[PDB]
Amino acid sequence: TLPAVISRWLSSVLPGGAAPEVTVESGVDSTGMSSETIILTARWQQDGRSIQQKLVARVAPAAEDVPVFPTYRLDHQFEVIRLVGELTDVPVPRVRWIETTGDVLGTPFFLMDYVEGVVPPDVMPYTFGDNWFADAPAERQRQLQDATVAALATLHSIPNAQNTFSFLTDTTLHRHFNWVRSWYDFAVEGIGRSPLLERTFEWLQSHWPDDAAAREPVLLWGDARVGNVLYRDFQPVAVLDWEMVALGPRELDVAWMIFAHRVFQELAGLATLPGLPEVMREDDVRATYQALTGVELGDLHWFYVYSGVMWACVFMRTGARRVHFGEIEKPDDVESLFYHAGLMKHLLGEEH
Ligand SMILES: Nc1ncnc2c1ncn2[C@@H]1O[C@H](COP(=O)(O)OP(=O)(O)OP(=O)(O)O)[C@@H](O)[C@H]1O
Ligand SMILES: [Ca+2]
Ligand SMILES: [Ca+2]
Ligand SMILES: [Mg+2]
Ligand SMILES: [Mg+2]
Known part of the structure; x- marks a missing residue:
């Protein structure tokens, strides 16, 4: 059909x-x-x-x-x-x-x-090794990383972004933030509440990144991560998976890309594997991005915390679907599904 x-x-x-x-x-x-x-x-x-x-x-x-x-x-x-x-x-x-x-x-x-082309895999997470990206030479991995950041920089450099992409919509962050709260609420209907997410939303509200949210928004790819790019010879050949595309501050995309790899580093740690600690380091990613766009990025901390809520939301939905299809048994605390809860607890304990 x-x-x-x-x-x-x-x-x-x-x-x-x-x-x-x-x-x-x-x-x-x-x-x-x-x-x-x-x-x-x-x-x-x-x-x-x-x-x-x-x-x-x-x-x-x-x-x-x-x-x-x-x-x-x-x-x-x-x-x-x-x-x-x-x-x-x-x-x-x-x-x-x-x-x-x-x-x-x-x-x-x-x-x-x-x-x-080939994609750094989600299953098993590429940080688990035994795939073409984890097994490549450092240099080639870093060449891929910088080409991916460059693709991001290029998307963020499209002129009059809110005009060009107006069909997509206080500020763009405020609006994006209310969408994230809607998504959480949607996920609750399927798995139950997370006291951690709820405290995190209060946290995000009361520590709003004013400067970042008052700058000119860019086109945001959304699920901006290496697992959503087809590659041939460590260069991007197709950027995929635009379902979280939006207009918003550029920090969201850059934080998401870095944090995404952090989630997979954490998963690799729990499988007691070493992962890929030199890939997608905040320092490397900020420097490349900043070298390419001449634009200084806001502190990413708030946008890591925010990516963590969005990831938790995906996990709540993954969870609802797995139990619906009998594939796993409802966990009794939904937060058990959040590999990264630890990461987030520590970010929330920081002061920026
Ligand atoms: N235009 C394309 N050409 C070739 N392969 C594609 C194309 N779009 C998607 N694919 C294959 O499908 C996989 C899924 O693509 P994408 O990540 O866009 O889908 P998904 O449903 O949103 O996301 P996820 O992998 O996060 O479930 C890609 O890694 C790729 O292997
Ligand atoms: Ca073109
Ligand atoms: Ca502290
Ligand atoms: Mg995808
Ligand atoms: Mg997707």
């Missing part, structure tokens, strides 16, 4: 007699969980020869699926990826079709071209 639909759209844009056939390459992750990103193969005839194209569909989840997010705007993700392609040389996939109604499949989706 996803394939039938793409086959149909294919029939409308290719020569008559193309007779396209679409099948699914990959509709689940490596743990057999159904995926929002679906890799498709399209085969057709042209001038008596076979053409074969891979296509990637991003589909909006149904309620029955236990969605991470309270709402979905794939149309926004579509337009941002398209605009990023038009206005920068940040590598992104070419977008092909958006169906915004949900009348065709049941739910909205968009279609992208396939980009070949």
